[PDB]
Amino acid sequence: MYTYIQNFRFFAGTYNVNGQSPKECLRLWLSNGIQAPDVYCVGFQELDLSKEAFFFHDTPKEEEWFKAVSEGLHPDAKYAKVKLIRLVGIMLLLYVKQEHAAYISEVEAETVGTGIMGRMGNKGGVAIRFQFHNTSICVVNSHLAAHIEEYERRNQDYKDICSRMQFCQPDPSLPPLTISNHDVILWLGDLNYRIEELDVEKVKKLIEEKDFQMLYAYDQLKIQVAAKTVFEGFTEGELTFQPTYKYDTGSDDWDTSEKCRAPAWCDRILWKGKNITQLSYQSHMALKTSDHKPVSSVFDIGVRVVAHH
Ligand SMILES: O=P(O)(O)Oc1cc(OP(=O)(O)O)c(OP(=O)(O)O)cc1OP(=O)(O)O
Numbered sequence: 001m002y003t004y005i006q007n008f009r010f011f012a013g014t015y016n017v018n019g020q021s022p023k024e025c026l027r028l029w030l031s032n033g034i035q036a037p038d039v040y041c042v043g044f045q046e047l048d049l050s051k052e053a054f055f056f057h058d059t060p061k062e063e064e065w066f067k068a069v070s071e072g073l074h075p076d077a078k079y080a081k082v083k084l085i086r087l088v089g090i091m092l093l094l095y096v097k098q099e100h101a102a103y104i105s106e107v108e109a110e111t112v113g114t115g116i117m118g119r120m121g122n123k124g125g126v127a128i129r130f131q132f133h134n135t136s137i138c139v140v141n142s143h144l145a146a147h148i149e150e151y152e153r154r155n156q157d158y159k160d161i162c163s164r165m166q167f168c169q170p171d172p173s174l175p176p177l178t179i180s181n182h183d184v185i186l187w188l189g190d191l192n193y194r195i196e197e198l199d200v201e202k203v204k205k206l207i208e209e210k211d212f213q214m215l216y217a218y219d220q221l222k223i224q225v226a227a228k229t230v231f232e233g234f235t236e237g238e239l240t241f242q243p244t245y246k247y248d249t250g251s252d253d254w255d256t257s258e259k260c261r262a263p264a265w266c267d268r269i270l271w272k273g274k275n276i277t278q279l280s281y282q283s284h285m286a287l288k289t290s291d292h293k294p295v296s297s298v299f300d301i302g303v304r305v306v307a308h309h
Contacts, residue, residue: 001309003134005275005302008100009037012299014141014188014267016292019049019089020249021064026072029284029294036074037298039132040095043141045190045292047089054088054122062086069093083128087111088121090189092141094128106131108167108177114144114160125161125189129182134304138182140165142189148262151220154193158230184301185272187234190292192266193221195243200262204254207242207263215243219265234270237297241283244293252285267295275302 013029030042048059066084073079073095080101082094090111096104107130115122125142142161145153166176179185195203195218206215216222216239224230243263246255255261269281277300284294 002307003304004307006305007275007300008039008132008303009035010039010041010186010299010301011037012041012139012186012188012269012297013294014043014045014190014269015287015294016045016143016190016267016290017065018046018249018290018292019061020289021061022068023289024287026068026287028286029296030069030072031074034074034280034298036077036097038097038100040073040079040093041139041186041188042069042093042095043139043188044091045089045141045143047086047091049089054120056088056121062091065091066093070095082130083107083109085109085111085126085128087113087124087126090121090124090126090141090143092126092128092139094130094139096132100132103133104130106136106170110165110167112161112164114157118160123157125157125165127161127165127167127179129167129177129179132303134306135184135302136182137184138167138179138186140179140185140187140189142187142191144190144192146192148194148196148220151193151196151224154191154220155224155229183273184276185234186299187231187270187272188268188295188297190266191221191268192264193219193224193268194264194266195262196220196223200260203262210242212239212242216265221265221268231270234272235276236268236270237278237281239265240281241295244283244295246291247288247293249291250288252288255291267292269295269297271299277301
């Protein structure tokens with residue numbers, strides 16, 4: 001027989017829920033204005049901010065946000081859960097259309113904590129790798145170090161997730177599988193890279209002027225990726241939406257606190273691999289449950305399908 005490449009719809013989502021429980025229907029983020037995707041990749045940050053969850057215990061939030069996502073998915077297709085992985089507050093969900101599950105194999109799920117003392121799960125990354133038909137796919141949900149001046153820590157947090165994240169393969173003699181050893185790599189999550197140089201007022205004025213081209217010129221990730229310190233070989237879509245950090249819970253008004261935190265593109269989606277075509281890169285202003293806004297991305301990814309007779 002022979003193999004050909006078939007395009008599939010992949011959904012990629014990130015949402016920092018800031019220890020909150022779902023108080024809004026997740027249809028606005030997961031299936032509003034889109035065709036039913038073939039594969040769903042739903043990542044989260046700060047799922048539970050309690051002491052109990054921090055000491056690696058279980059949480060009611062896991063099921064709370066799992067039911068909310070399942071219901072929020074596209075109603076035109078029946079979805080089957082492939083895997084669920086969670087490190088403290090960092091979660092990553094994988095769903096496929098029932099019709100695709102038979103062609104899903106070699107599923108692995110690993111966690112890497114890069115937080116307090118570079119080992120705790122407060123900040124780190126979770127990942128689900130699998131094989132859809134004849135193509136190896138790895139999805140990473142990372143929550144890198146917080147605050148503006150901590151850009152060198154964020155670069156190290158990326159290098160840590162990359163070097164420690166190893167998935168077991170069938171051949172034990174072969175070197176362990178790392179994120180880089182995959183046909184398709186989708187990296188999402190709260191990367192926390194802020195906006196440098198500019199004053200809090202200059203950042204807010206640029207968003208009012210809707211001049212995201214000028215604001216992006218000072219984006220810490222863009223600067224670090226150019227310096228070849230992070231996401232080497234990775235691509236990111238043009239930011240057409242306003243920064244998703246920091247809002248007042250229940251509104252679209254910027255942080256009105258003693259801190260008065262300056263806006264930043266904290267939640268990003270980046271890919272690496274052959275046959276990937278990004279169809280969209282949006283933010284969802286409608287969901288006010290957190291101080292962050294959910295970010296989505298829909299791709300047209302090529303998968304090697306076997307042609308029998
Ligand atoms: O390696 P082969 O036997 O020369 O090519 C075929 C392999 C097939 O899989 P299997 O190892 O025999 O189970 C095969 O089965 P299929 O009919 O595609 O489910 C057929 C093979 O040769 P083909 O009939 O595609 O020319």
